[PDB]
Design a binder for this molecule. Sequence first.
Ligand SMILES: [Ca+2]
Ligand SMILES: [Ca+2]
Ligand SMILES: [Ca+2]
Ligand SMILES: [Ca+2]
Lengths: 55, 273, 273, 26, 239, 243, 243
Amino acid sequence: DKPKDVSSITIIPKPRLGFPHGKGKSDAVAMRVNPVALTSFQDVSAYPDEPRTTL
Amino acid sequence: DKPKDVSSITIIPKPRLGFPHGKGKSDAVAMRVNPVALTSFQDVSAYPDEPRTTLDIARIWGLRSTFNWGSGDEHGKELFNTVLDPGLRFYDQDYEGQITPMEYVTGLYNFWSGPIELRFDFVSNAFHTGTVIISAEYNRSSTNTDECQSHSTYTKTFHLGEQKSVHFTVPYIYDTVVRRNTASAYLPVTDYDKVDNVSRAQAMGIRAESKMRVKVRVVNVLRPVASTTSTIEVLVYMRGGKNYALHGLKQSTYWPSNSVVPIDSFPPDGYDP
Amino acid sequence: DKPKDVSSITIIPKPRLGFPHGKGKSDAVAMRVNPVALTSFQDVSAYPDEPRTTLDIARIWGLRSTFNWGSGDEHGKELFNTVLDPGLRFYDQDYEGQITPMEYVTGLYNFWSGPIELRFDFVSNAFHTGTVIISAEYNRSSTNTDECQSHSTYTKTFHLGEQKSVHFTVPYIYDTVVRRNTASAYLPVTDYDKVDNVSRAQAMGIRAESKMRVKVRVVNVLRPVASTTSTIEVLVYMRGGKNYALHGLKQSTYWPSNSVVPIDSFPPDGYDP
Amino acid sequence: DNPHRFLPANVSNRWNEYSSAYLPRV
Amino acid sequence: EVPSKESIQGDATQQSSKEENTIITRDQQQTVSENIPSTVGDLVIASSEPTQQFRSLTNRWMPINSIRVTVNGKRNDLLAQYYIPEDFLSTHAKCAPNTIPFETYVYGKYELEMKFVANGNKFQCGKVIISVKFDSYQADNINTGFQAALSRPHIMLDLSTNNEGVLKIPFRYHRAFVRNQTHKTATAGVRPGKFASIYVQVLSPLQTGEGGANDMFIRPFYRYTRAEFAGMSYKVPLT
Amino acid sequence: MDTGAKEDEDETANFSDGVTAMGFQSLDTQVSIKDILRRPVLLFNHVELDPDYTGFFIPIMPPSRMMQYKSGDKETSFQRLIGRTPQAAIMNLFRFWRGSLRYTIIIHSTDGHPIYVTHVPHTGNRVYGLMKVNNLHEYTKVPIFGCGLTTEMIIPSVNPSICVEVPFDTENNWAVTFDEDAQRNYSWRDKGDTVTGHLVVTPVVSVYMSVWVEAGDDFEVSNFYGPPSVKTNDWNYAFSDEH
Amino acid sequence: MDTGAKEDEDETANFSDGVTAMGFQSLDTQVSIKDILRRPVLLFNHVELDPDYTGFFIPIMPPSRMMQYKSGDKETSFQRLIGRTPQAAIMNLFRFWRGSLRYTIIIHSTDGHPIYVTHVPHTGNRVYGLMKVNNLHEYTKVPIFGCGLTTEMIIPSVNPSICVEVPFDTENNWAVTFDEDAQRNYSWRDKGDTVTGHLVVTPVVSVYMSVWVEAGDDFEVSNFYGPPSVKTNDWNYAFSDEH
Ligand SMILES: [Ca+2]
Ligand SMILES: [Ca+2]
Ligand SMILES: [Ca+2]
Ligand SMILES: [Ca+2]
């Protein structure tokens, strides 16, 4: 069968996702084999005595 | 309140939905008052005895060929000999006539497979008597004068008498699970262009001609009584076996050759005499 | 009724889905009747003994080099001495030949790590006798005439006799968790362009040449009986250790050097003799 | 013409591939 | 695996292989390649009719041509090479009963085993490698060195220890069956009788001592462990 | 459909029926007649739309011999390979069809002008191409898309293509697929029973369009006619694998 | 594949096997052969499509030595680095492949003209580039995309790119990856076993396109051949870290 699909939605186009923000979401595409793999901080990570905020 | 909506998603734009497919989804918009109403098949619908698949059609017996058998045909003589390729009846000449249902439908695909069924109907009476041997020969073929080479294959010997018909299932024995059609997948020639080798070198493919043959040879010379005809016609029917398969839709190898007139505008195009 | 639909979402348009990735999602449209049907691997499928990863391939023993050992080679003499860099066999000359499986596959990555395995096969017989010492030297190297400097590293002394082969695991000891390949990540040169320093200054990177070496020195001079050959060949095999790792896909450093002919159109390009 | 089309007769079999009898190919 | 002290007949600790009406003994150890699978599932579809086996004829050991190894052989040199089943039908051991079924069936699936027996003496030395390349038609001249051999299913022979080697060859072809014979009436569009190649190559040159022999010999033996035939036809002479 | 099995009275032994190869290479089975008829067929390849006409008419009928090109006959705006498509070949076996058809229309443009597609139910005629309804000389003041009939619009700058499904708006139980002679002048009410209406495309400015057709989801064929006389000359246009 | 472990009979002591570094920097492991073959390879970089031809043919076959450029040989429309991509290097080790391939086609345009991509199943030939099928001189009346074969369309004004997955429509169990000589004239049916069909791109007006290929999800390789003879001259084109 080849039934018609009547689902639809109106959309508002924007060029970037979260461009001004320091947090939230990003639409960045990973230059990796696996789109969701990330850098590991299991062994090498920020030392606890390093400052975390400007305060 | 007028809260901001932060939901979003990245999208990939495409012009059509399901354009190449025969099933799945369609984004068709109905030219109806109700976008989801459909045609009713509650009362008027396809009759259950109509074919539903091309394989159903391939299962319809069709008259493929005919040949004569006379009291003058000596033992071992080939009464029938043909390459059994459902893709093309001839590799060296045009075909025009009433192609069988299975060949017609096979002409829509690039691949076929499975056993093929044959039925030999002897148009005789109870006073005709004789014996023939039907053989399916693969890869390598027999000499027209060497009956023994035919007898070494897949054979069925039929004792013609009170019964005037015999069924024969042609085994599918090849080095590939399916066979590719010998006809073309696309032929843009429409005006019977006189062909040359450049045209052929630039065809859609290369014809993988079959060497598989089915032959019928005389075992016991036909010996009808003097009072009846000394030569009878034998009808050869053909159709796909129950496990016949088809795949790879392509340009139809066969096309209507009789009473073909394209439509014109009615009544604008001079229908008003 | 024809109620308004107030649902909406903001979208970010992109031309392709998963273009750079080797896994994840794809927006590919199937050229099939059924948009979700797939190729069947029920009967025809990859054999279980075929390699599944590049690390599997790196675990195949390959003949790396060969060297001779004769009764004339005095104690301490280097019979074999090489920089053990799976990235490049030479830093000063072209390479042409049958590269080992592990080097071939390492040539597809910008980083490698883990122990490397070597196997020395002495092509001798029970009448050859002698002793050699294999050493893995890091950071700083030994003088060709100072056997003691080699003896101060990671060593394995092999007593050649009835057994004609010895395995050696080369430790991975570096100041980084992985090492970067010495070959290039991208080389656009295709016509053996005579190189100059401007070309080099504008290369894709800077070759971090390795100083790590593996040497084989004579401990006890080979003393075969007079009736047999006084010099034997030693085959040096190499492959990645069980914890060998590879990362950073790049342009392959190696390419076919034998019988390379690009395809042409068949049969259009003059196949019709 | 194209030298790749046909293998010289002395190194090939009737199928235009190296003969299994021709050991020097390597 | 373990030798014994000498007695009247020396160190009597040989092992042997008996297949049908053929036996082959070995004086030392033997190296064997892995037992690997062939494609299964296409047989019942490519052939509507039942396929056949004739084990008593095909599963016996048959020696083929003798191989000479000399001190002049260089690494990578081809000592011998076989296109199978073709070369076992029309060039080597042509009168072998193992070839009988190929005279009447046009198609087949074949799984073989090849045993190699060498005889170099205790003052000689050298290494030979035998490997198989599946579906090699028109690809024999690439991936054909000792390196490719060491990567594909192979066996290694040491010329002074005389260990035996057994290469197990499954049926891996791009079609369901391989064609058994060429024929004046058969198509020329498909080269038949070849689903694989076997190469015997020098890994390390044979060497000998002062006044020693400058050569030694190796003998290959084959047997089908599984030969299935399809498509009966009249019998024909092989190639 | 009558298989003819009724005439096969032989009951002697036969060779095996084997095992089907369907699904061995893949699960994409392509033998369902409806599946085949649901894939698009090109009718018009880059034809012109002229605003001086009411619009370009598309008769609602599936592909068949009714649109087959014959070497030597007058040139029409129909693409020449329609008669050899698998779906036309199938339709040439069934003289009845009921249900909707889907038309994919592409306007070769990126302008912001709306192009309208208007549906006309079964009215008795059967025409195609540009036509001036009632032979007037201006249609922008009396547009067919503004008369009350169901109409849809295409705006090329948003999407130059559209897929519309036309209903089975006719008085008959079934639509007649084909005639032996598409140009014979016979009883006029019967003449128009091979279509279920028309689709009319009207532009603002001159522009080109392409049209494809396929069966809708609510669609059935029947009245199997058996195969017609056919021809083929494929063999002559290719080499065999033996040179 | 035979590891050769069978020939390593030494059982004396060795140094440690250590701990793997895989996953230490990140979890993006790149050693899976199928993962590697699923990332795109550029075949044609900005090549021309001419409407005077049937279309531009793309033989369905993965990247390998069959497309390798050799300094000095005739210029083809294939990009010159295909033979050194990781996936071509992998394919040069496997002579069998089965399954689908995915083609990413980009039309350098923003026009509203539809560009069609037609799939041709295995027919026996192996061609690439612009071709006039059967050597005719006009194809708009007999378009390959309107003959019945599976076809998809690209409309640049909406999206100049598309990704199509072609099936494994062939009679063989496996497709043959490569030959020792891609130009040798040998048994014709065998010659065509290195492809599973073609993809044909047909424009309305002259325009350029780029093509990438990758393995589909339903894809397998086999018949490991071991490594071939190779070469490299990388060393000569860069400085070392010691000047
Ligand atoms: Ca029965
Ligand atoms: Ca049975
Ligand atoms: Ca240990
Ligand atoms: Ca340890």
